[model samples]
Target: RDIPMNPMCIYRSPEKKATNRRVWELSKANSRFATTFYQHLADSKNDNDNIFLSPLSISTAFAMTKLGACNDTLQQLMEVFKFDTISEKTSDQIHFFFAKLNCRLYRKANKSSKLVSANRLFGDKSLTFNETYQDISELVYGAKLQPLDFKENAEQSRAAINKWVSNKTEGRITDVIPSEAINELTVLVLVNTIYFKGLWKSKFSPENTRKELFYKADGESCSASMMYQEGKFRYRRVAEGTQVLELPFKGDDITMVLILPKPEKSLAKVEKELTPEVLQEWLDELEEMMLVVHMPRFRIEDGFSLKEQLQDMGLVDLFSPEKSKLPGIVAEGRDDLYVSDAFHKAFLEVNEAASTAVVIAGRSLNPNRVTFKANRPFLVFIREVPLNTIIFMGRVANPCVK
Candidate 1:
């Protein structure tokens, strides 16, 4: 199979399968974060660009770090992050959840589709971090710890970490840990990477693909290579103002959910009004019907410095050196440890076409030949279907622009 090795695998609780509904709830909560993040990004940055990210990648990285978080700091993280537990959970149980969830991705290589998620701990070699940190990270997390002498040469350390990320992502991501982001004082760096490649459940006909005018956010039209497909699909009419399309990958485990606005609506307005609950209502509502589709092929490789965004959303203590309590990362009693900065770099492509975050963050179909054209700006989500865990969220304004 070609699915990535997730930090967390699909957890199946036997006696209480009811408790497992929490799984879907957790995924839905993550989508909420996705909504918040996209709204924030849409207002200022990604309105005209392709939006992409792996919320699971970022969340797992932080979850590993959470093992070292003190009570107060962890409390804040739980709030900032959409931690899915209505019941009280222990630290061991949490890691146990991660261990159980770290299953091998099950996708056939014949289609040569790959979805791999990896997490590793990087540290300054100068200080011997708590031996427990290394042991636990290795035991439950799969990969062993990687040490670098950051104090002596931060640039060297940066280059090494960047190479690891790039290679793991198959070059879709590079320089995730930039030189400027690393400095002598840095002691710990937790990194997560995901590389996903899949064929459409139904590949669009290249012959039908044509050059079309894509209306940009700037009120001008540009040329795009528009691909065409017609099929019986599950679709939803999400209000008179919106249409939602569920397009799956070949494996059927994952899907691409496209949300488009009617001519009278703005992408920004749709974004501002969307939420996870509303998304669930839409999911409960997709109709299966036949339709003709027109979609643009575009690729997006973008990154975000999540420090400010995390702060604005309320994960303040974890970033503050004076207030953070990360005793598990370094010496047990030492108060000097803190997460210096949190950075995220994301890559996505429709690499001819394929597609989460925390905070703010579906569809069905009909009979009759309907036209589903993505000529203007719209939103898209690539995620695990059953769990509803979202991996990437994006908005397409000008598919051919970037």
Candidate 2:
């Protein structure tokens, strides 16, 4: 016999199967929130303004906050995140799934493309957090609560939190908490920082880059450094003149999906129908094809104070002082603590490089090749391929904006 066939080893473990199921369900829940949050964010902003954010980061940050929540405060978060549909799982079990998820993603890490999501809770030094809460927040979410003298030294506390964020993000993000955001009366501050830098698998020659006009949503144009390349990539056409292209980074672990609407088709029209079901259809319909690609080299650094946005999305009681019920966070005294402010900032830059080695294909090659020129506004999503988790999502209206 070439190898011993142990019956025990041949059979799959129920634990492994259940873990896989949990991760899949959690990923779906995460995607559901991603689309909903993006819709709200897009609605809140002007059509011409470029939007960028990490919905997963915001969700995880608040998931940690929900640890201390109770009653209506907890109920709102559960429904908003679609956790209620997970079925029959206790609150403790649900958090365990989240903890398992963090580890699974961490194991998929790559050195070529750096992707980091960091969350922290800066609480008043006087208050004591529950022993269980402190442990799970760190063990599950990898976020630790750091005590600060928010009562007396507000500015110093703000700077300290900002410094941690800056250092974690490789100095790309700084001063996340503005000067007046944290003061003596402030009891808690929640912050999430996400940073991504990845090189395209197939590098575009710098010599080919030329000045081009990028069409804006407002019927205007701006000069942009457009990069060009030819490769076989997964491509799909969801609607007339609207194309979707998958651009993979160096390692193939992370990919960016660009949804380019036609010149005549307004970006607003596509965004209006942007839903989780519709997005899944597009992704499912992607097929390999040979194509020429033209995209602008752009950078996006955007920040959001999510109090009102979350409130608009039915997350109410967590922010209110009187009606709030987050007693678990503090070990002693009343659960007067509520999230004072929540901040999310993201940094993303897309370019071309011949880093390692690395597009769309029709069943048969046509003499006339298809060209995907992203000269106009388009929607972007950077997601983990294996889990289909969206890391950063936004639209590029103009490349000129800092």
Supply the global lDDT for candidate 2.
Answer: 0.78
Q: What is the lDDT of every predicted structure here?
A: 0.69, 0.78
Q: Write the per-residue lDDT of candidate 1 for residues 1-402, one digit (tens) a residue.
A: 221222222222222212454344455545776777667767767566667777777766777777667657776675566563424443335555555445433334545567776676677775566566666667656665577888888888888888887887888788777657888987767667677877777777666678988887776788989887677678877776698988888868788888888873777778888787788787768887788888898877766667787788788888887888776655434656777665567777773233211121122445546778888888888877755677778888778863
Please give, for residues 78-129, the per-residue lDDT of candidate 2 as tens digits: 7787666566555555667787767666643555677667788888987788
**Once model 2 is optimally superposed onto the true structure by TM-score, how far is the C-alpha of residue 57 displaced, in angstroms?**
0.2
Find the candidate with the highest TM-score and give its number: 2
Each candidate structure's TM-score, on Cα atoms with residue i matched to residue i, is 0.85, 0.90
> Which residue pairs does candidate 2 place in steric collision?
232-359, 232-360, 233-359, 233-360, 288-361, 289-360, 289-361, 290-360, 290-361
